[PDB]
Coordinates of C-alpha atoms and ligand atoms in Angstrom, one line a residue:
Chain A
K7 CA -40.0 60.7 -63.3
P8 CA -38.5 62.3 -60.1
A9 CA -38.4 60.1 -57.0
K10 CA -41.4 59.5 -54.7
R11 CA -40.8 59.1 -50.9
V12 CA -42.2 56.0 -49.1
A13 CA -42.2 55.8 -45.3
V14 CA -42.4 52.3 -43.8
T15 CA -42.6 51.6 -40.2
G16 CA -41.6 48.5 -38.3
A17 CA -38.7 48.4 -40.7
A18 CA -36.8 45.7 -38.8
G19 CA -39.8 43.3 -38.6
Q20 CA -40.9 40.4 -40.8
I21 CA -43.5 42.2 -42.9
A22 CA -41.0 44.9 -43.7
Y23 CA -38.5 42.3 -44.7
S24 CA -40.8 40.9 -47.3
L25 CA -42.0 44.4 -48.3
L26 CA -39.0 46.6 -48.8
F27 CA -37.4 44.6 -51.6
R28 CA -40.4 44.4 -53.8
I29 CA -40.9 48.1 -53.2
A30 CA -37.4 48.9 -54.4
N31 CA -38.0 46.7 -57.4
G32 CA -40.8 49.0 -58.6
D33 CA -43.7 46.8 -57.6
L34 CA -45.5 49.6 -55.7
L35 CA -45.6 52.7 -57.9
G36 CA -44.4 51.1 -61.1
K37 CA -41.4 49.9 -63.2
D38 CA -40.5 53.6 -64.0
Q39 CA -41.0 55.5 -60.8
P40 CA -37.8 55.8 -58.8
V41 CA -38.4 55.7 -55.0
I42 CA -36.6 56.7 -51.8
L43 CA -37.2 54.6 -48.7
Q44 CA -37.6 56.3 -45.3
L45 CA -37.5 53.9 -42.5
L46 CA -38.8 54.0 -38.9
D47 CA -38.4 51.6 -36.1
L48 CA -37.4 51.6 -32.4
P49 CA -34.1 53.0 -31.0
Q50 CA -32.9 49.5 -30.2
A51 CA -33.8 48.1 -33.6
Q52 CA -31.7 50.7 -35.6
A53 CA -28.7 48.2 -36.0
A54 CA -31.1 45.7 -37.5
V55 CA -32.5 48.3 -39.9
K56 CA -29.0 49.0 -41.1
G57 CA -28.6 45.2 -41.8
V58 CA -31.7 45.4 -43.9
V59 CA -30.4 48.4 -45.7
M60 CA -27.0 46.7 -46.4
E61 CA -29.1 44.0 -48.1
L62 CA -31.1 46.4 -50.1
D63 CA -28.0 48.0 -51.4
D64 CA -26.6 44.6 -52.2
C65 CA -29.5 44.1 -54.7
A66 CA -28.4 46.9 -57.0
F67 CA -32.0 48.1 -57.7
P68 CA -32.1 50.8 -60.5
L69 CA -35.1 52.6 -58.8
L70 CA -33.8 53.0 -55.4
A71 CA -32.6 56.6 -55.2
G72 CA -31.9 56.7 -51.5
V73 CA -32.7 55.3 -48.1
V74 CA -33.3 57.1 -44.8
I75 CA -33.1 55.3 -41.5
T76 CA -34.3 56.7 -38.2
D77 CA -36.1 56.2 -34.9
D78 CA -37.8 59.6 -35.3
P79 CA -41.3 59.7 -36.8
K80 CA -40.9 63.3 -37.8
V81 CA -37.8 62.4 -39.9
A82 CA -39.3 59.1 -41.0
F83 CA -42.3 61.0 -42.4
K84 CA -40.9 64.2 -44.0
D85 CA -42.3 64.8 -47.5
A86 CA -43.5 61.2 -47.4
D87 CA -45.9 60.6 -50.5
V88 CA -46.8 57.2 -49.2
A89 CA -46.7 55.9 -45.6
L90 CA -47.0 52.3 -44.7
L91 CA -47.6 52.0 -41.0
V92 CA -46.6 48.4 -40.5
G93 CA -45.2 48.7 -37.0
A94 CA -47.5 48.0 -34.0
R95 CA -47.7 46.4 -30.5
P96 CA -48.5 42.8 -30.5
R97 CA -50.5 41.4 -27.5
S98 CA -48.3 39.4 -25.2
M101 CA -52.3 41.4 -21.6
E102 CA -56.1 41.5 -22.5
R103 CA -57.8 43.2 -25.4
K104 CA -57.7 46.2 -23.0
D105 CA -54.1 47.2 -23.6
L106 CA -53.4 45.8 -27.1
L107 CA -55.9 48.5 -27.9
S108 CA -54.4 51.1 -25.5
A109 CA -50.6 50.8 -26.2
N110 CA -51.3 51.1 -29.9
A111 CA -53.2 54.3 -29.5
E112 CA -50.0 56.0 -28.1
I113 CA -48.1 54.9 -31.2
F114 CA -50.8 55.9 -33.7
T115 CA -51.5 59.3 -32.2
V116 CA -47.9 60.1 -32.1
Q117 CA -47.4 59.1 -35.7
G118 CA -50.5 60.6 -37.2
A119 CA -49.4 63.7 -35.3
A120 CA -46.1 63.5 -37.0
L121 CA -47.6 62.8 -40.4
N122 CA -49.9 65.8 -40.4
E123 CA -47.0 67.9 -39.3
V124 CA -44.4 66.9 -42.0
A125 CA -45.8 64.5 -44.6
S126 CA -46.7 65.6 -48.1
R127 CA -50.2 67.1 -47.9
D128 CA -51.1 64.6 -50.6
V129 CA -49.9 61.5 -48.8
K130 CA -51.6 58.1 -49.1
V131 CA -51.5 56.3 -45.6
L132 CA -52.0 52.6 -45.3
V133 CA -52.2 51.0 -41.9
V134 CA -51.1 47.4 -41.7
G135 CA -50.4 46.9 -38.0
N136 CA -53.0 45.0 -36.0
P137 CA -55.6 46.1 -35.0
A138 CA -55.5 47.7 -38.5
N139 CA -58.9 49.6 -38.7
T140 CA -58.8 51.3 -35.3
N141 CA -55.1 52.1 -35.5
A142 CA -56.1 53.8 -38.8
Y143 CA -58.9 55.7 -37.2
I144 CA -56.6 56.9 -34.4
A145 CA -54.1 58.1 -37.0
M146 CA -56.7 59.8 -39.2
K147 CA -58.2 61.6 -36.1
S148 CA -54.7 62.8 -35.2
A149 CA -54.2 64.7 -38.5
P150 CA -57.0 67.2 -39.0
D151 CA -55.0 68.8 -41.8
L152 CA -54.9 66.0 -44.3
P153 CA -57.9 64.7 -46.1
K154 CA -59.5 62.1 -43.9
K155 CA -59.9 60.1 -47.1
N156 CA -56.2 59.4 -47.1
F157 CA -56.1 57.0 -44.3
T158 CA -56.9 53.4 -45.1
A159 CA -56.4 50.1 -43.4
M160 CA -55.5 46.9 -45.2
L161 CA -58.4 44.6 -45.9
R162 CA -56.7 43.4 -49.1
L163 CA -55.3 40.4 -47.5
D164 CA -58.6 39.2 -46.4
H165 CA -59.9 40.0 -49.9
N166 CA -57.1 38.0 -51.6
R167 CA -57.5 35.1 -49.2
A168 CA -61.1 34.8 -50.2
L169 CA -60.4 34.8 -53.9
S170 CA -58.2 31.8 -53.4
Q171 CA -60.9 29.9 -51.5
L172 CA -63.3 30.8 -54.4
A173 CA -60.9 30.0 -57.2
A174 CA -60.3 26.6 -55.7
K175 CA -63.9 25.8 -55.1
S176 CA -65.1 26.9 -58.5
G177 CA -62.1 25.3 -60.2
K178 CA -61.9 28.6 -62.1
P179 CA -58.6 30.8 -62.5
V180 CA -58.0 33.1 -59.6
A181 CA -57.2 36.0 -61.9
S182 CA -60.6 35.7 -63.7
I183 CA -62.7 36.5 -60.7
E184 CA -64.5 40.0 -60.8
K185 CA -66.7 41.8 -58.4
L186 CA -65.8 40.3 -55.1
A187 CA -66.4 42.2 -51.8
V188 CA -65.2 42.1 -48.2
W189 CA -67.0 44.0 -45.5
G190 CA -65.8 45.2 -42.1
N191 CA -62.9 44.8 -39.7
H192 CA -59.5 43.2 -40.6
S193 CA -60.4 40.3 -38.3
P194 CA -62.2 36.9 -38.0
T195 CA -65.3 39.2 -38.2
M196 CA -64.9 40.5 -41.7
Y197 CA -67.7 39.5 -44.1
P198 CA -66.3 38.0 -47.3
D199 CA -69.1 38.7 -49.8
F200 CA -69.4 37.0 -53.2
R201 CA -73.2 37.3 -53.9
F202 CA -72.0 39.5 -56.9
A203 CA -68.8 37.7 -57.9
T204 CA -68.4 36.6 -61.5
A205 CA -65.9 34.3 -63.0
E206 CA -64.8 34.4 -66.6
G207 CA -68.4 34.5 -67.6
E208 CA -70.6 33.1 -64.9
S209 CA -72.2 34.0 -61.6
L210 CA -70.3 32.5 -58.6
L211 CA -73.6 31.6 -56.7
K212 CA -74.7 29.8 -59.8
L213 CA -71.6 27.8 -60.4
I214 CA -71.1 27.0 -56.7
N215 CA -74.6 27.5 -55.3
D216 CA -74.0 25.4 -52.1
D217 CA -74.6 28.3 -49.7
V218 CA -73.8 25.9 -46.8
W219 CA -70.2 25.5 -47.9
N220 CA -70.5 29.2 -47.5
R221 CA -71.8 29.7 -43.9
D222 CA -69.9 26.6 -42.8
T223 CA -66.6 26.3 -44.6
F224 CA -65.8 29.4 -46.7
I225 CA -66.6 32.3 -44.3
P226 CA -64.7 30.9 -41.3
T227 CA -61.7 29.5 -43.3
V228 CA -61.1 33.0 -44.6
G229 CA -61.2 34.3 -41.0
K230 CA -59.1 31.6 -39.4
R231 CA -56.5 31.7 -42.2
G232 CA -53.9 33.7 -40.2
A233 CA -53.8 31.0 -37.5
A234 CA -53.9 28.2 -40.0
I235 CA -50.7 29.6 -41.4
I236 CA -49.1 29.9 -37.9
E237 CA -49.9 26.3 -37.0
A238 CA -48.3 25.0 -40.2
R239 CA -45.0 27.1 -40.3
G240 CA -44.9 28.5 -36.7
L241 CA -44.6 32.1 -38.0
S242 CA -47.2 34.6 -39.2
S243 CA -47.9 35.3 -42.9
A244 CA -45.6 38.2 -43.6
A245 CA -45.1 37.5 -47.4
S246 CA -48.9 37.3 -48.2
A247 CA -49.5 40.3 -46.0
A248 CA -46.7 42.3 -47.7
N249 CA -48.1 41.4 -51.1
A250 CA -51.6 42.6 -50.2
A251 CA -50.2 45.8 -48.9
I252 CA -48.5 46.2 -52.3
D253 CA -51.8 45.3 -54.1
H254 CA -53.8 47.8 -52.0
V255 CA -51.4 50.7 -52.6
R256 CA -50.5 49.9 -56.2
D257 CA -54.2 49.7 -57.0
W258 CA -55.0 52.9 -55.1
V259 CA -52.3 54.9 -56.9
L260 CA -52.3 53.2 -60.3
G261 CA -55.8 52.2 -61.1
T262 CA -58.2 49.3 -60.7
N263 CA -59.8 49.3 -64.2
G264 CA -63.3 49.1 -63.1
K265 CA -62.4 45.8 -61.2
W266 CA -63.7 46.0 -57.5
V267 CA -61.1 45.9 -54.7
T268 CA -61.8 45.9 -50.9
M269 CA -60.2 48.8 -49.0
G270 CA -60.7 50.0 -45.4
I271 CA -61.7 53.6 -45.8
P272 CA -63.5 56.2 -43.7
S273 CA -67.3 55.7 -43.7
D274 CA -69.3 58.2 -45.6
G275 CA -72.5 56.8 -44.1
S276 CA -73.7 54.2 -46.5
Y277 CA -74.7 50.6 -46.0
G278 CA -75.5 51.1 -42.4
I279 CA -72.2 52.2 -41.2
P280 CA -71.6 55.3 -39.1
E281 CA -69.5 58.2 -40.4
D282 CA -65.8 58.5 -40.0
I283 CA -65.5 54.9 -39.3
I284 CA -62.8 52.8 -41.0
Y285 CA -64.8 50.0 -42.5
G286 CA -64.0 47.6 -45.3
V287 CA -66.1 48.3 -48.4
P288 CA -65.7 47.5 -52.1
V289 CA -64.4 50.3 -54.4
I290 CA -63.1 51.2 -57.8
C291 CA -59.7 52.9 -58.1
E292 CA -58.6 55.3 -60.8
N293 CA -56.7 58.6 -61.1
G294 CA -55.1 58.0 -57.7
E295 CA -58.6 57.9 -56.1
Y296 CA -61.0 55.3 -54.7
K297 CA -64.7 55.6 -55.4
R298 CA -67.1 53.4 -53.5
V299 CA -69.4 50.9 -55.2
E300 CA -72.9 51.9 -54.4
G301 CA -76.4 50.7 -53.8
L302 CA -75.8 47.0 -53.5
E303 CA -78.7 45.0 -52.2
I304 CA -78.0 43.9 -48.7
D305 CA -79.9 40.9 -47.7
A306 CA -80.9 39.4 -44.3
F307 CA -77.9 37.1 -43.6
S308 CA -75.4 39.5 -45.2
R309 CA -76.4 42.3 -43.0
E310 CA -76.3 40.5 -39.7
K311 CA -72.7 39.7 -40.6
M312 CA -72.2 43.4 -41.6
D313 CA -73.6 44.5 -38.2
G314 CA -71.6 42.0 -36.2
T315 CA -68.2 43.2 -37.5
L316 CA -69.4 46.8 -37.3
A317 CA -69.9 46.3 -33.6
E318 CA -66.5 44.8 -32.9
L319 CA -65.3 48.1 -34.4
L320 CA -67.4 50.4 -32.2
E321 CA -66.4 48.2 -29.2
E322 CA -62.8 49.0 -30.5
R323 CA -63.3 52.7 -31.1
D324 CA -65.1 53.5 -27.9
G325 CA -62.2 51.8 -26.2
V326 CA -59.6 54.2 -27.2
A327 CA -61.9 57.1 -27.6
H328 CA -60.7 58.7 -24.5
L329 CA -58.2 60.9 -26.4
Chain B
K7 CA -46.8 30.3 -73.8
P8 CA -47.2 27.2 -71.8
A9 CA -46.2 27.1 -68.1
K10 CA -42.5 26.6 -67.5
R11 CA -41.8 24.2 -64.5
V12 CA -39.4 25.7 -62.0
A13 CA -38.2 23.4 -59.2
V14 CA -37.0 24.8 -55.9
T15 CA -35.4 22.8 -53.1
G16 CA -35.1 23.9 -49.4
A17 CA -38.7 25.2 -49.8
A18 CA -39.4 25.7 -46.1
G19 CA -36.1 27.7 -45.6
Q20 CA -35.2 31.3 -45.4
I21 CA -33.9 32.0 -48.9
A22 CA -37.0 30.2 -50.3
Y23 CA -39.4 32.4 -48.4
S24 CA -38.0 35.5 -50.1
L25 CA -37.7 33.8 -53.5
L26 CA -41.0 31.9 -54.2
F27 CA -43.1 35.0 -54.2
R28 CA -40.8 36.9 -56.6
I29 CA -40.9 33.9 -58.9
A30 CA -44.7 33.6 -58.7
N31 CA -44.9 37.3 -59.5
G32 CA -43.0 36.9 -62.9
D33 CA -39.6 38.1 -61.8
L34 CA -37.6 35.1 -62.9
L35 CA -38.7 34.4 -66.4
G36 CA -40.8 37.5 -67.4
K37 CA -44.2 39.0 -67.0
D38 CA -45.7 37.1 -69.9
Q39 CA -44.6 33.6 -68.8
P40 CA -46.7 31.5 -66.4
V41 CA -45.0 29.1 -64.0
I42 CA -45.5 25.9 -62.1
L43 CA -43.6 25.6 -58.9
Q44 CA -42.3 22.2 -57.8
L45 CA -41.1 22.3 -54.2
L46 CA -38.8 20.0 -52.3
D47 CA -37.8 19.8 -48.7
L48 CA -37.2 17.2 -46.0
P49 CA -40.0 14.9 -44.9
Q50 CA -40.6 16.7 -41.6
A51 CA -40.6 20.0 -43.3
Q52 CA -43.7 19.1 -45.4
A53 CA -46.2 20.9 -43.1
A54 CA -44.1 24.1 -43.1
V55 CA -44.0 24.0 -47.0
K56 CA -47.8 23.6 -47.2
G57 CA -47.9 26.7 -45.0
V58 CA -45.9 28.7 -47.6
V59 CA -48.0 27.4 -50.4
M60 CA -51.1 28.5 -48.6
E61 CA -49.6 32.0 -48.4
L62 CA -48.7 31.7 -52.1
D63 CA -52.3 31.0 -53.0
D64 CA -53.3 33.9 -50.8
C65 CA -51.4 36.3 -53.1
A66 CA -53.6 35.6 -56.1
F67 CA -50.8 35.6 -58.7
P68 CA -52.0 35.4 -62.4
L69 CA -48.7 33.7 -63.5
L70 CA -48.9 31.0 -60.9
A71 CA -50.4 28.0 -62.9
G72 CA -49.8 25.2 -60.3
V73 CA -47.8 24.0 -57.4
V74 CA -46.4 20.6 -56.5
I75 CA -45.1 19.9 -53.0
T76 CA -43.0 16.8 -52.2
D77 CA -40.1 15.3 -50.2
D78 CA -39.0 13.2 -53.2
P79 CA -36.3 14.6 -55.6
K80 CA -37.6 12.6 -58.6
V81 CA -41.0 14.1 -58.1
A82 CA -39.7 17.6 -57.5
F83 CA -37.7 17.4 -60.6
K84 CA -40.0 15.7 -63.1
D85 CA -40.0 17.8 -66.3
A86 CA -38.3 20.7 -64.5
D87 CA -37.2 23.5 -66.9
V88 CA -35.4 25.4 -64.3
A89 CA -34.1 23.9 -61.0
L90 CA -32.9 26.1 -58.1
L91 CA -31.0 24.0 -55.6
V92 CA -31.2 26.1 -52.5
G93 CA -31.3 23.6 -49.7
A94 CA -28.1 22.2 -48.2
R95 CA -26.5 21.0 -45.0
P96 CA -25.8 23.9 -42.7
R97 CA -22.6 23.8 -40.5
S98 CA -23.0 23.2 -36.7
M101 CA -18.6 20.0 -37.3
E102 CA -15.5 20.3 -39.3
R103 CA -15.5 21.5 -42.8
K104 CA -14.0 18.3 -44.2
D105 CA -17.2 17.3 -42.5
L106 CA -19.6 19.6 -44.1
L107 CA -18.4 18.9 -47.6
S108 CA -19.4 15.2 -47.6
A109 CA -22.7 15.9 -45.8
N110 CA -23.5 18.0 -48.8
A111 CA -21.9 15.9 -51.5
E112 CA -24.2 13.1 -50.2
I113 CA -27.2 15.4 -51.1
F114 CA -26.0 16.6 -54.5
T115 CA -25.2 13.1 -55.7
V116 CA -28.8 12.2 -55.0
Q117 CA -30.2 15.3 -56.6
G118 CA -27.9 15.4 -59.5
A119 CA -28.9 11.8 -60.4
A120 CA -32.6 12.8 -59.9
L121 CA -32.2 15.7 -62.4
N122 CA -30.5 13.2 -64.6
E123 CA -33.3 10.7 -64.6
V124 CA -36.4 13.0 -64.9
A125 CA -35.8 16.6 -65.8
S126 CA -36.2 18.2 -69.2
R127 CA -33.0 17.6 -71.3
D128 CA -32.5 21.4 -71.3
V129 CA -33.1 22.1 -67.6
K130 CA -31.1 25.1 -66.2
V131 CA -29.7 24.3 -62.8
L132 CA -28.4 27.0 -60.4
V133 CA -26.9 25.9 -57.1
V134 CA -27.4 28.5 -54.5
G135 CA -26.8 26.3 -51.3
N136 CA -23.3 26.2 -49.8
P137 CA -20.6 25.4 -50.7
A138 CA -22.1 26.4 -54.0
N139 CA -19.3 25.7 -56.6
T140 CA -18.6 22.3 -55.2
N141 CA -22.2 21.3 -55.0
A142 CA -22.8 22.4 -58.5
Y143 CA -19.8 20.3 -59.6
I144 CA -20.9 17.2 -57.8
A145 CA -24.4 17.7 -59.1
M146 CA -23.1 17.9 -62.7
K147 CA -20.9 14.9 -62.4
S148 CA -23.9 12.9 -61.3
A149 CA -25.9 14.1 -64.4
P150 CA -23.9 12.4 -67.2
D151 CA -26.9 12.8 -69.6
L152 CA -27.5 16.5 -69.2
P153 CA -25.2 19.0 -70.7
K154 CA -22.3 20.2 -68.4
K155 CA -23.0 23.8 -69.5
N156 CA -26.4 23.9 -67.7
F157 CA -24.9 23.4 -64.2
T158 CA -24.0 26.7 -62.4
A159 CA -23.3 28.0 -59.0
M160 CA -24.2 31.4 -57.8
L161 CA -21.6 34.2 -57.7
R162 CA -24.0 36.9 -58.5
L163 CA -24.5 37.9 -54.9
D164 CA -20.8 38.6 -54.8
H165 CA -21.0 40.5 -58.1
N166 CA -24.0 42.4 -56.8
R167 CA -22.2 43.2 -53.4
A168 CA -19.2 44.4 -55.3
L169 CA -21.5 46.7 -57.3
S170 CA -22.7 48.5 -54.3
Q171 CA -19.2 48.8 -52.7
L172 CA -18.0 50.4 -55.9
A173 CA -21.0 52.6 -56.2
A174 CA -20.6 53.9 -52.7
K175 CA -16.8 54.5 -53.2
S176 CA -17.0 56.2 -56.6
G177 CA -20.2 58.0 -55.6
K178 CA -21.7 56.9 -58.9
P179 CA -25.2 55.2 -59.3
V180 CA -25.1 51.5 -59.1
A181 CA -27.2 50.9 -62.2
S182 CA -24.6 52.9 -64.2
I183 CA -21.7 50.6 -63.4
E184 CA -20.4 48.2 -66.2
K185 CA -17.9 45.5 -67.0
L186 CA -17.2 44.1 -63.6
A187 CA -15.9 40.6 -63.1
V188 CA -15.8 38.4 -59.9
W189 CA -13.6 35.3 -60.3
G190 CA -13.5 32.0 -58.5
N191 CA -15.3 30.5 -55.5
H192 CA -18.4 31.7 -53.7
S193 CA -16.4 32.4 -50.6
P194 CA -14.2 34.9 -49.0
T195 CA -11.3 33.8 -51.3
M196 CA -13.3 35.2 -54.2
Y197 CA -11.8 38.0 -56.5
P198 CA -13.9 40.9 -57.4
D199 CA -12.1 42.6 -60.2
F200 CA -12.8 46.2 -61.3
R201 CA -9.8 46.9 -63.7
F202 CA -12.2 46.9 -66.7
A203 CA -15.2 48.4 -65.0
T204 CA -16.9 51.7 -66.2
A205 CA -19.3 54.1 -64.7
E206 CA -21.3 56.4 -67.1
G207 CA -18.3 55.8 -69.3
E208 CA -15.4 56.9 -67.1
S209 CA -13.1 54.2 -66.0
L210 CA -13.6 53.0 -62.5
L211 CA -9.9 52.1 -61.9
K212 CA -9.1 55.6 -63.0
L213 CA -11.8 57.3 -60.7
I214 CA -11.0 55.4 -57.6
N215 CA -7.2 55.1 -58.1
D216 CA -6.6 53.5 -54.7
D217 CA -4.9 50.1 -54.4
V218 CA -4.8 50.5 -50.7
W219 CA -8.6 50.8 -50.6
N220 CA -9.0 47.9 -53.1
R221 CA -6.7 45.6 -51.3
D222 CA -7.7 46.4 -47.7
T223 CA -11.3 47.4 -47.6
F224 CA -12.9 46.4 -50.9
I225 CA -11.9 42.8 -51.3
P226 CA -12.5 41.7 -47.9
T227 CA -15.7 43.8 -47.4
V228 CA -17.2 42.1 -50.4
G229 CA -15.8 38.9 -49.1
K230 CA -17.1 39.1 -45.5
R231 CA -20.4 40.8 -46.3
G232 CA -22.6 38.0 -45.2
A233 CA -21.1 37.9 -41.8
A234 CA -21.7 41.6 -41.5
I235 CA -25.4 41.1 -42.4
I236 CA -25.7 38.6 -39.5
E237 CA -23.8 41.0 -37.2
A238 CA -26.4 43.7 -37.9
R239 CA -29.5 41.7 -38.4
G240 CA -29.2 38.5 -36.4
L241 CA -30.3 36.5 -39.4
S242 CA -28.6 35.7 -42.7
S243 CA -29.0 37.7 -46.0
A244 CA -31.9 35.6 -47.3
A245 CA -33.5 38.4 -49.3
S246 CA -30.5 39.7 -51.3
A247 CA -29.6 36.0 -52.0
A248 CA -33.0 35.4 -53.4
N249 CA -32.5 38.5 -55.5
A250 CA -29.2 37.5 -57.1
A251 CA -30.5 34.0 -57.8
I252 CA -33.3 35.8 -59.8
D253 CA -30.7 38.0 -61.5
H254 CA -28.6 35.0 -62.3
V255 CA -31.4 33.0 -63.9
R256 CA -33.3 35.9 -65.5
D257 CA -30.1 37.2 -67.2
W258 CA -29.3 33.6 -68.3
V259 CA -32.6 33.1 -69.9
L260 CA -33.6 36.6 -71.0
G261 CA -30.1 37.9 -71.8
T262 CA -27.8 40.7 -70.7
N263 CA -28.0 42.8 -73.9
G264 CA -24.2 43.0 -74.2
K265 CA -23.4 43.6 -70.5
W266 CA -21.2 41.4 -68.3
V267 CA -22.4 39.3 -65.5
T268 CA -20.6 36.8 -63.3
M269 CA -21.6 33.1 -63.3
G270 CA -20.2 30.1 -61.7
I271 CA -19.7 27.8 -64.7
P272 CA -17.7 24.7 -65.6
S273 CA -14.3 25.8 -66.9
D274 CA -13.5 25.3 -70.5
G275 CA -9.8 25.6 -69.6
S276 CA -9.7 29.5 -70.3
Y277 CA -7.6 31.7 -68.1
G278 CA -5.6 28.7 -66.7
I279 CA -8.4 27.0 -64.8
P280 CA -8.5 23.2 -65.2
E281 CA -11.5 22.0 -67.2
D282 CA -14.9 21.4 -65.6
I283 CA -14.0 23.0 -62.3
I284 CA -16.9 25.4 -61.5
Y285 CA -15.4 28.8 -61.3
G286 CA -16.8 32.3 -61.5
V287 CA -15.9 34.3 -64.7
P288 CA -17.5 37.1 -66.6
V289 CA -20.1 36.1 -69.3
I290 CA -22.5 37.8 -71.7
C291 CA -26.0 36.2 -72.2
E292 CA -28.0 35.9 -75.3
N293 CA -30.9 33.5 -76.6
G294 CA -30.8 31.4 -73.4
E295 CA -27.0 30.8 -73.6
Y296 CA -23.9 32.4 -72.1
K297 CA -20.7 33.3 -73.9
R298 CA -17.4 33.7 -71.9
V299 CA -15.8 37.1 -72.1
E300 CA -12.3 36.4 -73.4
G301 CA -8.8 37.6 -73.8
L302 CA -8.8 39.6 -70.7
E303 CA -5.4 40.7 -69.5
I304 CA -4.5 39.1 -66.1
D305 CA -2.0 41.1 -64.2
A306 CA 0.3 39.5 -61.5
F307 CA -1.8 40.6 -58.4
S308 CA -4.9 39.3 -60.2
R309 CA -3.2 36.1 -61.1
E310 CA -2.3 35.5 -57.5
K311 CA -5.9 36.1 -56.4
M312 CA -7.4 33.9 -59.1
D313 CA -4.9 31.1 -58.2
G314 CA -5.7 31.4 -54.5
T315 CA -9.4 30.8 -55.2
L316 CA -8.5 28.0 -57.5
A317 CA -6.4 26.3 -54.7
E318 CA -9.5 26.3 -52.5
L319 CA -11.8 24.7 -55.1
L320 CA -9.2 21.9 -55.9
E321 CA -9.1 21.2 -52.2
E322 CA -12.9 21.2 -51.7
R323 CA -13.4 18.8 -54.6
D324 CA -10.5 16.7 -53.4
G325 CA -12.5 15.9 -50.3
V326 CA -15.5 14.8 -52.0
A327 CA -13.7 13.0 -54.8
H328 CA -14.9 9.5 -53.8
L329 CA -18.6 9.5 -54.4
Ligands
MG401 MG1 -23.5 44.9 -65.2
NA402 NA1 -35.7 23.9 -43.5

């Protein structure tokens, strides 16, 4: 096949460093799709990006047809077929500015995407706060299907499969129908009321339901910090892997298996429209199709509404644009 | 297939962080072969290793069948089918001084592999100084075959492929029959007299000894310092990648192509027996076969003898022990 173009921001950072090499290896679009990597980061981080590119070249990857490097979003995004917006401001400063400084960045870049990117582009926002950055980008590109901006919930989703695999003693790969609702945050609702496992209901097998409110939910949400405390650095490799899973799956197909994906609300489940909210989906033909009419019980929906308010608190905070 | 056990030392380090995930993903032994990771690092690195293992779990890899974590070599190595010795003493200290620091580690680990590994374990030394650690390791494993101890030169081979590909303007994946002789260091000799791109002869195409002598050899030789110049950290990721190339070619084969490995000399090309020295090989059915009868010209002979002088000298300093 001819090459596809992948834009990746925050090219000099840790998530990028785990990401770029599996991308060049064919992990993202497949073992037979060449790719061309187009890389943004700050003016002062250009030298470091070159350093990363010298390392990519030194891997001799068959599929890497070319690399572009630049501090200009408009160049970074030209003819981009996928864009991974990994770069973002970290808080260093109250929830007030984290939210504000990132709006700048994500209006600018969505502006640029809508101006130059392939009309057919798949956007995935990784930079925290993922959902709202996404929303700001989507909003900033009236010309591209709103359905093309997603935020990464797949790391929360994957973290929860490991908690479940462990608990049930069952093989992580043999878990179907798991769901994660809401914000990429401590607030997301990891939902297994439907999960199976190589035959059996996960409620059945585990039952407990206290391990659930008490251990499970909050372990999955405090996982990022648990990783920092142990190694003193954030989880770039698991985050890059989930970004790969999210995009691979989106493009290539999910096979009726459910995956969780932050995508613009249509209106279901109690979520306002045009809101980037994690909900389960099935992927096929380069498209995601939501999983519908799931019974939403009492507990489940107080959690769904709690995360869905953090979001509105987030939205209405940047809304002045 | 049953799970193959792959031991990895220096597990909380930088190379490791860019290598464990690719291994878990299938990249080292194939997409149809499950693995068990056995990880070693210092006692006060145990918490950092658990961190990385948490992240590993959070990737939900189907090929990842189990994980062992430990600060005990005999534990890390028990039943190991592949052992990647990545950890080593960093410099900070005179060389004579760093050689013995490291010999002290590889005598311990070489004896550990000797006592507990599978009889057929494949060992790749990645940590520096690679050839001399491999050698010490093998001398301490009197009961495992000498042919299963190797040092990594593949990052040199791979760095020379990109240099060539840039100069000749040919695609890297098209380059063939390149050899890199000697020590994993700047005294190494990347030799393209036999190399072909698409079929044309490289030495023909490039026809420039000035370029060869003045840019090429020392660009390939000093590359790692250039990565640090640009990036501020060392070339962890492309190192992880050549390790995977090294091992994967070794086990799965090269299908007739040449690749460089640091192997124990059989006395060919005028290298004294058992010194670990890079030479070109071809892999099939889990073994390598030296490429022989190559013509060594006088410039080449001088280079190959310069890198042999350095290996004799390194070993001469760890001789006792
Ligand atoms: Mg080759
Ligand atoms: Na370490």
